[PDB]
Amino acid sequence: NTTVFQGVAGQSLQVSCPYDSMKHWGRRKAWCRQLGEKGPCQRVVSTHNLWLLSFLRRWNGSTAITDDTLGGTLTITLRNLQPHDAGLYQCQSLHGSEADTLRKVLVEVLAD
Numbered sequence: 001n002t003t004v005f006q007g008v009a010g011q012s013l014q015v016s017c018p019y020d021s022m023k024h025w026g027r028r029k030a031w032c033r034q035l036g037e038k039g040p041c042q043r044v045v046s047t048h049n050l051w052l053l054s055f056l057r058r059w060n061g062s063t064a065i066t067d068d069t070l071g072g073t074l075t076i077t078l079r080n081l082q083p084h085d086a087g088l089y090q091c092q093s094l095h096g097s098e099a100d101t102l103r104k105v106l107v108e109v110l111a112d
């Protein structure tokens with residue numbers, strides 16, 4: 001059961017990944033995109049490298065990430081949604097070599 005997010009193309013879309021603020025305390029977060037089914041997942045952007053500053057927005061081009069570590073809500077903004085921006089993404093909580101999956105989403109688009 002993934003979840004879906006619909007966006008009008010040319011205007012911005014926000015996705016929210018809720019999580020347990022305590023379970024993932026001190027953990028960096030990342031937003032990545034999927035290719036085909038089984039893999040790979042490729043990192044688009046991660047929250048600030050210093051956890052106390054993860055409330056700072058981070059950008060990879062048109063994609064922004066911000067983390068509310070106290071309330072436990074990660075928020076990704078796809079500014080100016082595009083057709084090619086559509087696809088299957090996930091939010092990740094990182095620890096050591098591994099990453100755990102916080103939420104799994106599709107993005108949809110409509111022109112005009």
Ligand SMILES: *[C@@H]1O[C@H](CO)[C@@H](O)[C@H](O)[C@H]1NC(C)=O
Nearest residue numbers: 033042043044045060061063
């Ligand atoms: C930023 O650009 C795209 C995100 O869509 C990705 O392929 C690339 O690896 C990103 N850069 C880094 C350093 O993660």
